[PDB]
A paper describes a structure:
The small unsaturated hydrocarbon is detected by a family of receptors (ETRs) located in the membrane of the endoplasmic reticulum, which rely on a monovalent copper cofactor to detect this hydrocarbon. The copper-transporting P-type ATPase RAN1 (HMA7), located in the same membrane, is known to be essential for the biogenesis of ETRs. The AlphaFold2 model also predicts three domains at the N-terminal end, all with ATX1-like folds (henceforth referred to as MBDs) and a Cα atom RMSD < 1 Å with respect to each other. MBD3 may function as an anchor, stabilizing the RAN1-ETR1 complex while MBD1 and MBD2 are involved in a copper relay system.
Numbering used by the authors: 21 to 98
The structure:
């Protein structure tokens, strides 16, 4: 059956147009351990459901930043 599923809530800055959003969605879809996500392109709110046994929140946030080439600024919301 399915495994552990944790959630990470993020504020994303740097989405200036529809192209930037699709770039970000592409990064998330290719990131190992990401199971689902919801992105509001206008507010920058991003929720990510990930398997904590495959990727940690630490590695997940770092991965998006690295894959984004500094275009996206990530802040974790509590």
């Amino acid at each position: 059956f399915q495994g552990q599923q944790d959630k990470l809530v993020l504020r994303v800055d740097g989405i200036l147009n529809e192209l930037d959003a699709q770039v970000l969605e592409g990064i998330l879809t290719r990131l190992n351990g990401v199971r689902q996500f919801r992105l509001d392109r206008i507010s920058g709110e991003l929720e990510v459901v990930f398997d904590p046994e495959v990727v940690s929140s630490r590695s997940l946030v770092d991965g998006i930043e690295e894959d984004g080439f500094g275009k996206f600024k990530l802040r974790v919301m509590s």
